[PDB]
Every structure is written in C-alpha cells, then in structure tokens.
C-alpha cells in the first residue's frame, strides 16, 4: 500500500508510486526519474498515464517498453495543465531527465516535491524565485552535518589529471570505470575526452546512453571495445578478480589498469581531502573511489531550504527509524529559528 509522504492532497495524483499496483482514486501517475527505486513496477502492461520528462520518457519506452500512448512527457520551466490542475518540472541537478514537480492546488495551497535532488544556488533563479510554497518534500538523504563531500566539478579534475598523468607516463595502460544505472555519465566522458579516445561499453549500456539526449553522443561512444581505451563494466566486476579477469580478453594490448569507482558519501571523506586520495594496489591494477555525489551535502540542502521558507517538510528519505525522523526534524527547526521563518 502506497505511503503518505508519495501522496499529492486534493488531487488525483502520486509521485513515484508503482510499486503497489492500482493506488485508489489515482488518475494520473508522476515520474521523477529514471532509478530502479523510483520506477519500479512499471513494464510494457501498463495501461494509466505516465507523467514525466522527455528523457524519462525514451527510457520507459525503449529500456521498459511501456507502450507509447501512455507516456506524456512534459517540457521544463513550463506551466502545464494536467487533470485540470497546473505544474511545473524543473530540473533536479540529479541523473539525466530527473525533475522536481511543482503543484498548484485548487484550493490555492503550492507543494514543491524535489524527487531526488542535489542542491545548487542556480535553482533559486528557476520559476520557484516568484513564490510561497506551502509544503516541502524533500529529498533528505545526507541530511545530517557529517555528510561533506567536493563539488562535482572537482572530482572530475582529480579524475581527469589523475587519469592523463597515467597514461602519459603508461601509454599500454586501460582505463576502467564502473556503472549500475543511470547518472554520473561526467565521469567517462571527461577521461575519455582528455584521452582523445571513445568509450566502449556493452550493448545494454549503449542503448541506455542512446536515450539521454547528450549532444553529439554518436562521438563520444562505442560498442567496438577494440577501438576503445576507455571501457565500462558494469561496478560489481570493478575489483582486483574482475579486472585481471577483463585484462585478459583484451589481447595483449595493454599491461597495466587504472579504474574508477564512483560511489556516494563514504566515511573516508572525514579525513580525506580529494586531493589527497589514494588508490587501492596490486601488481599492475589500481582502484580509486571517488565521492561523485548527485544529491545534495548537508550544506546545500540547508542553503535551499533556507531560501525556499517553505511552511511545513516532509521527509522522503532516512523516514523508517523514531531515531532517523527525530534526528531531521531538530535541524528543520534549527534552520527555521535561524533564518526567522
Ligand atoms: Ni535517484
């Protein structure tokens, strides 16, 4: 059965709700984005109106095949009227095609429900800069003061410099990186970009690829792993047995591997600035782990929230244990006593 904080009041509408089969009274079904939390339950015998972004729409149809006369995709920064009621998708500094859902009531109440999110100033010069929002659901994964990391933009210069500096002085050397879902795509591209080479990967991931709307992507990626010095696999093989395994088929081209994990937050970051990150060595193969994060720190969801004044917050994220929701709720109301709210 389908929880309250996924519940739009006073419409016939939810928000990453299809998991729970037919929820009662609902017209209309909203996506946020494309991660297997968020969808799941959807396939090709789905038979309601699915709401959702240009992107997330390619992705129910051609990874899922939902059918098409049940996918309405919606453009950004847009006032659109569904089920006679207007929204908004803005977007979410997330995965690709990952939105925010504004919703205007009819009875005059305004709900901004961020999906997943990560936090940036640039938001507060969206549509939301004109006006009251009533209720807040917010995406509330690293919602605790520990939970620090580097911007995006910083991690991939250390993976860029850290990659260029290895194959300069290794020119038999692979580059590896691991994925298992959408998101964090900067990762490849920008090695593979300062290699001057393609990234070769699996069919499956290339058909997702496919689906992005990544501009001139035809010239960036590959299927012909043997035209390719920067290869994909999938995270679970990124370990010293998987990546020995994969040097072998690769024909004697190559004597060395660098390879690249991209997690979340990690404890490590505690301690460890990015500059000063190591990787984990034996013989010719090494592995970093690096904190590329697509939501928000603690910072920037204090930062936003702060801005926005929203009147009440519902968490979406950390909501199953008493110690978890006491735990947000007493920074909720530390930011509000500060800002004047
Ligand atoms: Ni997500």
Same mark, same amino acid.
Not at 73 to 80: H, K, Y
Not at 96 to 120: C, E, K, S, W
Not at 315 to 328: A, C, I, L, Y
């Given at each position: 059965?389908?929880?309250?904080?996924?519940?739009?009041?006073?419409?016939?509408?939810?928000?990453?709700?299809?998991?729970?089969?037919?929820?009662?009274?609902?017209?209309?079904?909203?996506?946020?984005?494309?991660?297997?939390?968020?969808?799941?339950?959807? +396939?090709?015998?789905?038979?309601?109106?699915?709401?959702?972004?240009?992107?997330?729409?390619?992705?129910?149809? !051609?990874?899922?095949?939902?059918?098409?006369?049940?996918?309405? %995709?919606?453009?950004?920064?847009?006032?659109?009227?569904? !089920?006679?009621?207007?929204?908004?998708?803005? &977007?979410? !500094?997330?995965?690709?095609?990952?939105?925010?859902?504004?919703?205007?009531?009819?009875?005059?109440?305004?709900?901004?429900?961020?999906?997943?999110?990560?936090?940036?100033? +640039?938001?507060?010069?969206?549509?939301?800069?004109?006006?009251?929002?009533?209720?807040?659901?917010?995406?509330?994964?690293?919602?605790? %003061?520990?939970?620090?990391?580097? +911007?995006?933009?910083?991690?991939?210069?250390?993976?860029?410099?850290?990659?260029?500096?290895?194959?300069?002085?290794?020119?038999?050397?692979?580059?590896?990186?691991?994925?298992?879902?959408?998101? *964090?795509?900067?990762?490849?591209?920008?090695?593979? &970009?300062?290699?001057?080479?393609?990234? #070769?990967?699996?069919?499956?991931?290339? *058909?997702?690829?496919?689906?992005?709307?990544?501009?001139?992507?035809?010239?960036?990626?590959?299927? &012909?792993?043997?035209? +390719?010095?920067?290869?994909?696999?999938?995270?679970?093989?990124?370990?010293? *047995?998987?990546?020995?395994?994969?040097?072998?088929?690769?024909?004697? *081209?190559?004597?060395?591997?660098?390879?690249?994990?991209?997690?979340?937050?990690?404890?490590?970051?505690?301690?460890?600035?990015?500059?000063?990150?190591?990787?984990?060595?034996?013989?010719?193969?090494?592995?970093? #782990?690096?904190?590329?994060?697509?939501?928000?720190?603690?910072?920037?969801?204090?930062?936003?929230?702060?801005?926005?004044?929203?009147?009440?917050?519902? %968490?979406?994220?950390?909501?199953?244990?008493?110690?978890?929701?006491?735990?947000?709720?007493?920074?909720?109301?530390?930011?509000?006593?500060?800002?004047?709210?």
């Amino acid at each position: 059965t389908c929880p309250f904080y996924k519940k739009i009041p006073g419409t016939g509408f939810t928000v990453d709700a299809f998991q729970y089969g037919v929820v009662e009274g609902c017209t209309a079904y909203f996506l946020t984005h494309f991660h297997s939390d968020h969808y799941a339950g959807l +396939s090709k015998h789905f038979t309601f109106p699915v709401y959702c972004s240009e992107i997330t729409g390619n992705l129910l149809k !051609n990874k899922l095949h939902v059918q098409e006369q049940y996918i309405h %995709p919606l453009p950004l920064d847009t006032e659109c009227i569904v !089920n006679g009621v207007k929204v908004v998708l803005l &977007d979410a !500094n997330h995965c690709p095609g990952a939105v925010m859902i504004l919703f205007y009531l009819p009875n005059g109440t305004v709900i901004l429900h961020t999906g997943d999110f990560r936090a940036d100033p +640039s938001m507060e010069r969206s549509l939301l800069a004109d006006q009251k929002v009533h209720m807040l659901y917010l995406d509330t994964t690293y919602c605790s %003061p520990e939970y620090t990391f580097p +911007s995006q933009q910083e991690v991939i210069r250390f993976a860029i410099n850290t990659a260029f500096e290895a194959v300069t002085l290794n020119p038999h050397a692979l580059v590896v990186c691991g994925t298992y879902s959408i998101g *964090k795509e900067k990762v490849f591209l920008a090695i593979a &970009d300062v290699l001057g080479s393609k990234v #070769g990967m699996s069919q499956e991931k290339y *058909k997702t690829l496919q689906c992005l709307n990544i501009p001139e992507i035809n010239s960036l990626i590959t299927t &012909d792993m043997c035209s +390719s010095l920067v290869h994909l696999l999938p995270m679970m093989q990124i370990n010293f *047995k998987g990546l020995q395994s994969h040097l072998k088929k690769c024909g004697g *081209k190559y004597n060395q591997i660098l390879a690249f994990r991209p997690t979340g937050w990690t404890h490590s970051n505690k301690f460890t600035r990015i500059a000063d990150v190591i990787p984990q060595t034996k013989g010719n193969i090494s592995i970093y #782990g690096i904190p590329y994060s697509e939501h928000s720190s603690y910072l920037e969801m204090k930062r936003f929230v702060q801005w926005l004044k929203p009147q009440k917050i519902i %968490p979406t994220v950390n909501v199953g244990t008493w110690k978890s929701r006491s735990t947000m709720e007493k920074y909720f109301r530390e930011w509000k006593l500060e800002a004047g709210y």
